[PDB]
Design an enzyme around this catalytic site. Sequence first.
Site, PDB file in Angstrom:
ATOM      1  N   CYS B  46       0.842  -1.188   0.000  1.00  0.00           N
ATOM      2  CA  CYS B  46       0.000   0.000   0.000  1.00  0.00           C
ATOM      3  C   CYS B  46       0.877   1.237   0.000  1.00  0.00           C
ATOM      4  O   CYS B  46       1.986   1.225   0.578  1.00  0.00           O
ATOM      5  CB  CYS B  46      -0.938  -0.072   1.211  1.00  0.00           C
ATOM      6  SG  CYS B  46      -1.916   1.491   1.465  1.00  0.00           S
ATOM      7  N   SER B  48       0.664   3.704   1.774  1.00  0.00           N
ATOM      8  CA  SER B  48       0.943   4.118   3.143  1.00  0.00           C
ATOM      9  C   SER B  48       2.180   3.436   3.723  1.00  0.00           C
ATOM     10  O   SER B  48       2.836   3.993   4.555  1.00  0.00           O
ATOM     11  CB  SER B  48      -0.198   3.810   4.086  1.00  0.00           C
ATOM     12  OG  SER B  48      -1.362   4.564   3.711  1.00  0.00           O
ATOM     13  N   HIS B  51       4.880   5.500   2.550  1.00  0.00           N
ATOM     14  CA  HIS B  51       4.932   6.729   3.239  1.00  0.00           C
ATOM     15  C   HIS B  51       5.819   6.609   4.490  1.00  0.00           C
ATOM     16  O   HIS B  51       6.379   7.615   4.998  1.00  0.00           O
ATOM     17  CB  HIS B  51       3.535   7.220   3.720  1.00  0.00           C
ATOM     18  CG  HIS B  51       2.621   7.729   2.670  1.00  0.00           C
ATOM     19  ND1 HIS B  51       3.067   8.191   1.472  1.00  0.00           N
ATOM     20  CD2 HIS B  51       1.266   7.845   2.661  1.00  0.00           C
ATOM     21  CE1 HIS B  51       2.031   8.580   0.740  1.00  0.00           C
ATOM     22  NE2 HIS B  51       0.925   8.405   1.450  1.00  0.00           N
ATOM     23  N   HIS B  67       0.361  -3.667   6.497  1.00  0.00           N
ATOM     24  CA  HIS B  67      -0.864  -3.558   7.191  1.00  0.00           C
ATOM     25  C   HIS B  67      -2.033  -4.096   6.386  1.00  0.00           C
ATOM     26  O   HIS B  67      -3.139  -4.116   6.969  1.00  0.00           O
ATOM     27  CB  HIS B  67      -1.134  -2.092   7.616  1.00  0.00           C
ATOM     28  CG  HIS B  67      -1.240  -1.209   6.431  1.00  0.00           C
ATOM     29  ND1 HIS B  67      -0.166  -0.775   5.712  1.00  0.00           N
ATOM     30  CD2 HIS B  67      -2.342  -0.746   5.792  1.00  0.00           C
ATOM     31  CE1 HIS B  67      -0.605  -0.074   4.672  1.00  0.00           C
ATOM     32  NE2 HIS B  67      -1.932  -0.024   4.691  1.00  0.00           N
ATOM     33  N   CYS B 174      -7.168  -3.210   3.509  1.00  0.00           N
ATOM     34  CA  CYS B 174      -6.935  -1.779   3.407  1.00  0.00           C
ATOM     35  C   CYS B 174      -7.452  -1.153   2.161  1.00  0.00           C
ATOM     36  O   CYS B 174      -8.505  -0.509   2.220  1.00  0.00           O
ATOM     37  CB  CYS B 174      -5.430  -1.424   3.594  1.00  0.00           C
ATOM     38  SG  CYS B 174      -5.283   0.398   3.515  1.00  0.00           S
TER      39      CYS B 174
HETATM   40  N1  NAI Z   1      -7.643   7.097   4.644  1.00  0.00           N
HETATM   41  C1  NAI Z   1      -7.217   5.819   4.718  1.00  0.00           C
HETATM   42  O1  NAI Z   1      -7.646   5.044   5.574  1.00  0.00           O
HETATM   43  C2  NAI Z   1      -6.168   5.359   3.791  1.00  0.00           C
HETATM   44  C3  NAI Z   1      -5.419   6.140   3.046  1.00  0.00           C
HETATM   45  N2  NAI Z   1      -4.435   5.799   2.134  1.00  0.00           N
HETATM   46  C4  NAI Z   1      -3.800   6.786   1.305  1.00  0.00           C
HETATM   47  O2  NAI Z   1      -4.477   6.915   0.054  1.00  0.00           O
HETATM   48  C5  NAI Z   1      -3.522   7.414  -0.936  1.00  0.00           C
HETATM   49  C6  NAI Z   1      -3.578   6.502  -2.215  1.00  0.00           C
HETATM   50  O3  NAI Z   1      -2.982   5.270  -1.892  1.00  0.00           O
HETATM   51  P1  NAI Z   1      -2.732   4.259  -3.104  1.00  0.00           P
HETATM   52  O4  NAI Z   1      -3.884   4.231  -4.008  1.00  0.00           O
HETATM   53  O5  NAI Z   1      -2.206   3.003  -2.492  1.00  0.00           O
HETATM   54  O6  NAI Z   1      -1.530   5.071  -3.753  1.00  0.00           O
HETATM   55  P2  NAI Z   1      -0.921   5.131  -5.253  1.00  0.00           P
HETATM   56  O7  NAI Z   1       0.360   5.847  -5.081  1.00  0.00           O
HETATM   57  O8  NAI Z   1      -1.038   3.809  -5.952  1.00  0.00           O
HETATM   58  O9  NAI Z   1      -1.909   6.105  -6.093  1.00  0.00           O
HETATM   59  C7  NAI Z   1      -1.854   7.497  -6.017  1.00  0.00           C
HETATM   60  C8  NAI Z   1      -2.055   8.014  -7.442  1.00  0.00           C
HETATM   61  O10 NAI Z   1      -1.973   9.425  -7.362  1.00  0.00           O
HETATM   62  C9  NAI Z   1      -1.441   9.895  -8.571  1.00  0.00           C
HETATM   63  N3  NAI Z   1      -0.857  11.213  -8.363  1.00  0.00           N
HETATM   64  C10 NAI Z   1       0.278  11.556  -7.661  1.00  0.00           C
HETATM   65  N4  NAI Z   1       0.448  12.898  -7.673  1.00  0.00           N
HETATM   66  C11 NAI Z   1      -0.609  13.423  -8.321  1.00  0.00           C
HETATM   67  C12 NAI Z   1      -0.985  14.728  -8.624  1.00  0.00           C
HETATM   68  N5  NAI Z   1      -0.220  15.801  -8.244  1.00  0.00           N
HETATM   69  N6  NAI Z   1      -2.084  14.920  -9.239  1.00  0.00           N
HETATM   70  C13 NAI Z   1      -2.943  13.827  -9.682  1.00  0.00           C
HETATM   71  N7  NAI Z   1      -2.598  12.520  -9.445  1.00  0.00           N
HETATM   72  C14 NAI Z   1      -1.453  12.369  -8.766  1.00  0.00           C
HETATM   73  C15 NAI Z   1      -0.351   8.874  -8.944  1.00  0.00           C
HETATM   74  O11 NAI Z   1       0.026   8.903 -10.331  1.00  0.00           O
HETATM   75  C16 NAI Z   1      -0.990   7.603  -8.489  1.00  0.00           C
HETATM   76  O12 NAI Z   1      -1.606   6.899  -9.531  1.00  0.00           O
HETATM   77  C17 NAI Z   1      -2.143   7.434  -0.228  1.00  0.00           C
HETATM   78  O13 NAI Z   1      -1.845   8.748   0.312  1.00  0.00           O
HETATM   79  C18 NAI Z   1      -2.355   6.514   0.951  1.00  0.00           C
HETATM   80  O14 NAI Z   1      -1.455   6.714   1.999  1.00  0.00           O
HETATM   81  C19 NAI Z   1      -4.534   4.458   1.667  1.00  0.00           C
HETATM   82  C20 NAI Z   1      -5.224   3.601   2.406  1.00  0.00           C
HETATM   83  C21 NAI Z   1      -5.964   3.909   3.620  1.00  0.00           C
HETATM   84  O1  BNF Z   2      -3.130   2.630   4.576  1.00  0.00           O
HETATM   85  C1  BNF Z   2      -3.570   2.623   5.777  1.00  0.00           C
HETATM   86  N1  BNF Z   2      -3.385   3.332   6.879  1.00  0.00           N
HETATM   87  C2  BNF Z   2      -2.430   4.379   7.096  1.00  0.00           C
HETATM   88  C3  BNF Z   2      -3.055   5.642   7.576  1.00  0.00           C
HETATM   89  C4  BNF Z   2      -2.257   6.509   8.320  1.00  0.00           C
HETATM   90  C5  BNF Z   2      -2.768   7.731   8.747  1.00  0.00           C
HETATM   91  C6  BNF Z   2      -4.062   8.028   8.389  1.00  0.00           C
HETATM   92  C7  BNF Z   2      -4.843   7.149   7.622  1.00  0.00           C
HETATM   93  C8  BNF Z   2      -4.342   5.932   7.214  1.00  0.00           C
HETATM   94 ZN    ZN Z   3      -3.130   0.957   3.367  1.00  0.00          ZN
END
Ligand code: NAI
Ligand code: BNF
Ligand code: ZN
Lengths: 374, 374
Positions: B46, B48, B51, B67, B174
């Site tokens: 993931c 994250s 990150h 995770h 996740c």
């Molecule tokens: N709120 C929550 O519980 C969770 C949050 N996260 C977060 O969600 C986000 C996405 O995670 P994934 O899908 O695994 O990541 P990922 O990195 O696969 O996808 C992110 C996408 O954003 C695009 N991108 C990057 N910069 C950009 C910009 N300036 N403008 C437009 N597109 C842009 C990338 O090309 C990429 O395809 C991450 O920040 C992650 O940490 C993920 C899981 C749980």
């Molecule tokens: O990808 C999953 N969890 C990581 C996470 C960290 C901080 C806030 C939301 C989610």
């Molecule tokens: Zn995650």
Amino acid sequence: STAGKVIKCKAAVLWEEKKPFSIEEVEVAPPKAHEVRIKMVATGICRSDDHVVSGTLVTPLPVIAGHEAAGIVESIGEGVTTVRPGDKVIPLFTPQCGKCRVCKHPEGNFCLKNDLSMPRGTMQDGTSRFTCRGKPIHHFLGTSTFSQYTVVDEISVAKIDAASPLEKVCLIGCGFSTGYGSAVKVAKVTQGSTCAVFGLGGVGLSVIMGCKAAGAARIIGVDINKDKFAKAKEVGATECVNPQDYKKPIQEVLTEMSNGGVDFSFEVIGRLDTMVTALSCCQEAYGVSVIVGVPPDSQNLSMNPMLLLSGRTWKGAIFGGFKSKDSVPKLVADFMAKKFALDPLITHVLPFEKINEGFDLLRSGESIRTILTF
Amino acid sequence: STAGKVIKCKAAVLWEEKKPFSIEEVEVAPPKAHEVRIKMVATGICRSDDHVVSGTLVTPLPVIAGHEAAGIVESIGEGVTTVRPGDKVIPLFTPQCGKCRVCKHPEGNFCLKNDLSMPRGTMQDGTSRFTCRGKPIHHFLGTSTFSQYTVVDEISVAKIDAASPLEKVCLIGCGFSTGYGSAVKVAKVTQGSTCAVFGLGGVGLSVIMGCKAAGAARIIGVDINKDKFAKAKEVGATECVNPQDYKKPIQEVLTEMSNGGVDFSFEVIGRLDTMVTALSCCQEAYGVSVIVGVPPDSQNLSMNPMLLLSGRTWKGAIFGGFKSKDSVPKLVADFMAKKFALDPLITHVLPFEKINEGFDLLRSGESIRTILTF
Ligand SMILES: NC(=O)C1=CN([C@@H]2O[C@H](COP(=O)(O)OP(=O)(O)OC[C@H]3O[C@@H](n4cnc5c(N)ncnc54)[C@H](O)[C@@H]3O)[C@@H](O)[C@H]2O)C=CC1
Ligand SMILES: O=CNCc1ccccc1
Ligand SMILES: [Zn+2]
Ligand SMILES: NC(=O)C1=CN([C@@H]2O[C@H](COP(=O)(O)OP(=O)(O)OC[C@H]3O[C@@H](n4cnc5c(N)ncnc54)[C@H](O)[C@@H]3O)[C@@H](O)[C@H]2O)C=CC1
Ligand SMILES: O=CNCc1ccccc1
Ligand SMILES: [Zn+2]
Ligand SMILES: [Zn+2]
Ligand SMILES: [Zn+2]
């Protein structure tokens, strides 16, 4: 006898920022098609009118301000269908055109014909109905109620009950309905919940009223002026806190008091800092915070988006989220059935000619709402 | 046979930010009371977890990250009642204790036992179950799945269907559930609406899945990497836009495409600027914007609160708003019943030992989810 004629009357003109209103003679044109000319009966002094004076709220000058009012239709232009001469009316600072994508949405009220986002200070047709010293004078939110007569578009007026007491129900034109609806409609306060209301002026008191009506268990009023507390408790606050009494920041205090954050919080002041504090004091996973206060023009706030990622909801609204022309007549009907009270908001009554004293009362902290009578 | 004994196994340890993971021999202590030791079967990579490498997400180091996983219970500590040895399980990076005020609330899911807000990188008791050459290694979100075996608190694990394919359903832990729930539960996307999804990785794809399941008529994907568009369209995007293609800001583009703003927007990247763009592009009176992406540590965004005063709603959520222990089994049951697909998210499958290759694939932009198998 004035139908079809220019009226000469008194109005409170604001020629410049940070100056007193000037009571002087203006000329009021007759209504054009789909316009309504209203003889004012009562108008309240809202903090937003003062924001025009201070430059907090930008609108073109010179202007006839005032937007919380009630009156009687003097005459209608061609094609008007929804009111008639002699009808009691409340001007609507948020119009309801009934045709735009917002007016058709079940939750939207910020009609696309508003003059709030990009203010032109005109009628819908882009012209003014007011002349003073031979110069055109701007309108304010399509209302302009600090005048013995005003002209409004049909979509900016609602017919109300013929027996309404206009010197009270003018508050339904802004401050009561904004606060009340911010609680009942926007936040959707739930039975048994804990609310925090930041700012205990007329709008914040009305937010308390709505929280109480929704059945909140705890309503915590917050104000730096402890003279506001007595009235806030009369209308339903269970506790009041003054941030100046505490060493910790007030979001910390409230989060403690509420055993981990409040269910609903309201910013009813208009400060960037308090918007962020009010968001922070709602419970991090399921709290809702509603911005009601008008922020200083063009200024941004700064905040940590982690406050939202944990699950908070942040929203704002104009006019309590009420579709204005649908809702105002119903609100009046509810007031005449005594479903809510307005008297607790009215601390002072003055004749229109003493408008500057009314603004001094607001600015000094002494009043909630001053009603001006014409 | 390993019950009550220390296990020696391999795990991927992150000793320092901005370094590769190091495959190390570690010692995994047996579970103490109300703890569960799990033999991993599959874990997704993931963003994250990345990150933590990049310093976007701060958590104590050294650490075993991971995770988004599934495995099989190897043993249980004293007093465990919700799983037994041999059960298929998904670890829960957001716990569900069942007793705190959030677990009791109908909407809340950010249980107060979480290790997200103020990360300690321990078990609930404040200690670690991992050692590498005598040195304690921190846990990650009470899960730590980049290991052949991990130990988790009982509130951080859910039993799932005995017949479920672990190499697929690990994504329920996740990315899938976060995206899908953000749309269906947090935003509550409506039939016939217009949605904009910023970020077309695994989580953003899952947002599109949820928007389509909710009956959205238009789903606009936004990504700077146009190689993501084909898969976004396969899972329900009606249109895709690359902000780099345009000589004006993308919020203006989206507002014109949607004839005045979208109904729902989602930030699924983790950038402050895109959080504010996504809010801006939803319709000013009734639009909803959901922050899903994880922002860089301790950084604040800047925004004009008038975006909210018009009527917009801004919220965020963890794990799609799902109460984790209740929802994960049901999501797995729904996958087994063909209610949603997971294969469109899986672009690569690698043995665990090739974790760094998996991260290289993510960072280069090639992969959506790489699944690591044991
Ligand atoms: N709120 C929550 O519980 C969770 C949050 N996260 C977060 O969600 C986000 C996405 O995670 P994934 O899908 O695994 O990541 P990922 O990195 O696969 O996808 C992110 C996408 O954003 C695009 N991108 C990057 N910069 C950009 C910009 N300036 N403008 C437009 N597109 C842009 C990338 O090309 C990429 O395809 C991450 O920040 C992650 O940490 C993920 C899981 C749980
Ligand atoms: O990808 C999953 N969890 C990581 C996470 C960290 C901080 C806030 C939301 C989610
Ligand atoms: Zn995650
Ligand atoms: N969203 C909407 O549609 C509307 C918004 N408004 C706005 O709502 C706000 C309140 O309006 P009124 O009740 O008429 O104003 P008001 O001036 O009577 O009341 C504001 C209260 O805030 C308190 N206050 C000031 N600074 C404070 C601080 N730092 N912390 C805590 N309390 C503080 C004051 O002591 C006062 O009692 C104004 O900004 C106004 O422009 C009003 C009507 C409609
Ligand atoms: O007080 C009434 N209207 C003023 C107003 C200005 C901007 C935003 C909301 C309200
Ligand atoms: Zn309209
Ligand atoms: Zn007002
Ligand atoms: Zn809990």
